[PDB]
Symmetry: C6
Subunit: 108 residues, 6 copies
């Protein structure tokens, strides 16, 4: 029961989430402004975080908190509709123009 | 015996635990006040730690010790019923609204 | 040479439950601990369970936690060989019976 | 089911992308000159980033932003056709002379 | 072709090697004394590096260069027969008393 | 669709490459002397980087740029024939004396 597996990254968005009103401990632990909804994206390969941050900014009026190409994460802040618009555009671009597996937009 | 594996993160909570009465060494090696129960959460993708910390704080009177989006871990302190309430709300949101695989609430 | 998507999540297991009855001086210096006593070494997955295992180990005889590493899923402790074995036995018993984790036997060196 | 998996890296380019006109927060978050298109490459094994950066520079007159052998990533800037030429040459060399699995050139 | 895989570390020694007479660049890159043979061990789980360093010291007259519990590596120096003795004792203990998969002693 | 995978490192050289004449941006991003060909090696387990650096130096007149036992990478510089000789000797030793899976010598 031993097998060689050549490990490469898959192509998927695992999380596309909006936190409508984060608690103060979340703004503090994130080092961000204590206002606005939070957009959280999880992507593979990790390098696609730069593409998703570009789409998020181009889609709506948002403030990029971080573009992490080392963990494949993107965080941004703004009004709840601006944050949803960026998440929607990220999911639409990665599914329709990149052929990535995508999850639905989740809200909390 | 050789296969290419496209690696992506799964969606699951692997640990939702309460340590009812931690030992002074555990309080010390964590940089916390030497009183109250400890809530420990393990999540995948690692980005979901921010969501779980938000739900924990909104559910009950907790003190977030850390929100680690790099390791997908959350740790908080409070009374044993407050800590259990936050763990219960984390598990019920991730199962019912996110479709994540969840473990039961464990106590030590 | 086919291709398969693998959703990676951590498994639930203790991979090492070990006691070193009398470590050599170089082991104590690399660790940076008191130059006396047996060494308890635990390897756990998920890595967050290191805090739980430290608690349960500390819930038994004269233990000195050398480190609780939630980043690597490791726990180290120094005490008398029977105190160290007791801690290791309790960790294995709790994780198997109350957590449903796969466990290895207590090993001695 | 329980199986031993000998983990070795696979041989593939997972992302060969051009961001035609990045937003100012992308230039800022990258620490690069606020001008030109952005080329983004994801490779496995991570060591092949040095080979791809050498081919990118030899192919067109780009400006290498980073060659990351720790993450297997390459980022470069230049005119959109120079960036597309470098990406095309990287894909061509890796497929035809290295036997690596390659993705198509993507644009955003 | 999509599967959830619960990842845990396997139990094995992947390398038990002696470099009889290393070149000066190898002593330089390792930050070690420019004298003696080099013993190199690769182990999984990474925590077993402390066990293997204990056996290596107890088995023969060696000078531990590093005990890396973060990478699962052990490096030691000494006369070629002392280094071989330590490697042999590490392999014998891990196979017979731990049930780990082992490789043979290799020399260069 | 859930399987436990015991992860251990495989034994293979994934890249044995010579860049005959790197561009100045490559010498720069590497922090090396602006002269000579570049030898690039990718190995698993990561500890075998020390063995490969020793063989490279013993085989031909090369200057080790880095021996990375954390990433399993080796980089060296010298004349194109010295660099090819060292790559050939690493591939020969790892296949014939270690039983590692090897790739061919690639040139760019």
């Amino acid at each position: 029961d031993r097998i060689i597996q050549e490990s490469v990254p898959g192509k998927q968005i695992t999380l596309a989430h909006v936190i409508a009103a984060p608690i103060e401990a979340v703004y503090e632990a994130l080092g961000v402004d204590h206002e606005g909804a939070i957009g959280v994206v999880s992507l593979t390969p990790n390098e696609t975080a730069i593409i998703a941050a570009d789409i998020a900014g181009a889609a709506a009026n948002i403030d990029i908190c971080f573009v992490d190409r080392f963990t494949g994460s993107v965080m941004f802040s703004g009004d709840i509709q601006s944050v949803e618009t960026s998440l929607e555009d990220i999911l639409e671009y990665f599914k329709n123009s990149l052929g990535f597996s995508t999850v639905p937009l989740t809200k909390s």
